[PDB]
Amino acid sequence: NVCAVQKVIGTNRKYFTNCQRKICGKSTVISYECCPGYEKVPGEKGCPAALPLSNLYETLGVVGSTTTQLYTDHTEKLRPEMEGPGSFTIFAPSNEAWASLPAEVLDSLVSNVNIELLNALRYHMVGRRVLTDELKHGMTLTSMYQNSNIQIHHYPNGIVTVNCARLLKADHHATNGVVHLIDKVISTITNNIQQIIEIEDTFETLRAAVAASGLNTMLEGNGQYTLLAPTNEAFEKIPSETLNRILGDPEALRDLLNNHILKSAMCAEAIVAGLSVETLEGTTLEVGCSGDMLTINGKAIISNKDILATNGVIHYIDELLIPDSAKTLFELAAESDVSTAIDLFRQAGLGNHLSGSERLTLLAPLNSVFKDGTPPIDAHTRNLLRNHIIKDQLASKYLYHGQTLETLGGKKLRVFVYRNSLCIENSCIAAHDKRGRYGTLFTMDRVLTPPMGTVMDVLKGDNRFSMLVAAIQSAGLTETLNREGVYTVFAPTNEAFRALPPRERSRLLGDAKELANILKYHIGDEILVSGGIGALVRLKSLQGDKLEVSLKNNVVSVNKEPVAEPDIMATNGVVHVITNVLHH
């Protein structure tokens, strides 16, 4: 028989439930009264006695809706109907609700009490008894004023709403019906979302965008939406070149308008905590609240909440919500996790690829790659960057093994797709794609090191592996580590060969075919860059037995023996540098 109130400290807003920690970021205190209609006797057992039912007019005073009671009484015609025959509900505004009306609208009501005040009170009423049992999301009650509909919603969290007024105290039975207490005075709903946009002067840039895009027919139509409508002042915070480029292009335009529209009508006093919501374009937004401010992604950019329409709810927003798919590469990458990278592109002359409509894919590494320093701008940097800019617009989820990607600097880089990572040359994808209108940003964990020759060119140009190229020659393996292939050479240095045991180097020297078998064991038949090693991967060697290739604590190991220098790229493989020679 017991109930509870939770109240935010330093406020007036209270939520009247049965018997959540914070709400809109503000701490709560919970206070126990018991449910409207029952009394405390002298002590006894904890709300014993129920009060008698009174009829709907007197029930108004019992719930605390004395202004609604006073206004009803001063019409001389609704009060006798309220205390006589029938079955009724009234969604009765609180005392604070009438006082929160604008002076100009409340004067209009109380100066004509037999028409406009009576019409207002009749619109809050339904000619049948309707409990919150009968209230489910999306349904329309018929009011007693001129058959006008009342919009009610019922959100997951338990908040009932009635024309986007929160229902405060529910289900107070009358002898001829029920009384509900709501916190707004509500009014008739006569316009669709399209029709409001064509009336308000604050939306003339919005109405033209809708007109250019052909979304008028949708916004005239049925079903429920939320419009995060941008004012003219929102469109003026966007620089002219950026905005005209979006609005000019039909795809970018419809992506923009759909990023301002939700699939269900939700309204502001239903928002009590963080709720991720998708727009029609596909982007998730973070809708919260801080005080009585609505917040979008933690920004109090909503200046006018709960503007009502027959096909949904409009909230006015102050900043345009431009999605990734309407942005250029520069707009989607400059104030982000690849900020250091994009500054290097523009300083090295390559900025005009990123700033317009060129269909590109960008491989920009993370900012933690450049924590220890940044390379200087020269010929060699701006040629290397020019090879991180790939022709055509790509999606990484659609890349395939042994795909080749042309750069703007003439190279062809190889896509290697492994089970837990995707790699282009040595570099691997570190975060999700950012798909813009014209180009897409791939987010990388290394600066990439493109191949500059063959496996034999790596080894003959480096003096650590001169005993290895001699063994490769003496096993007849030069001509095949130099033609086209996909190898993984675990290449032992000179000090590895001079480390060899007597019985193993005697098997190396005394038969050229046994030397061929030991060197073919060192060579994988796939390309396995370090970014494609999981916990452990088995790798078929050209001898035929498998190699055990792990990555623990950022060191590649092969059969539990360490790689000193991973990922030296080559036009027909990858070279990893090992410090000793593998056995059998």
Author numbering: 47 to 65, 70 to 634
Question: What does the study report here?
Answer:
The function of corneal TGFBIp is elusive, but its ability to bind both integrins and ECM molecules indicates a role in cell adhesion. TGFBIp consists of an N-terminal CROPT domain followed by four fasciclin 1 (FAS1) domains (FAS1-1, FAS1-2, FAS1-3, and FAS1-4). The X-ray crystal structure of wildtype TGFBIp reveals an elongated banana-shaped molecule with the five domains arranged like pearls on a curved string.
A striking feature found in both the R124H and R555W structures and involving their mutated residues is a crystal packing interface between the FAS1-1 and FAS1-4 domains of different TGFBIp molecules, where residue 124 interacts with residue 555 in a second TGFBIp molecule (i.e., His124 and Arg555 in R124H, Arg124 and Trp555 in R555W). In the R124H structure, the FAS1-1 His124 is in direct contact with Arg555 through a side-chain hydrogen bond. His124 also engages in a second water-bridged interaction with the main chain of Met517. In addition, multiple hydrophobic interactions involving side chains of Tyr121, Leu120, Met517, Phe547, Leu550, and Leu559 surround His124 and Arg555. Instead, the position of the α-helix is likely to be determined by the intermolecular contact with the FAS1-1 domain.
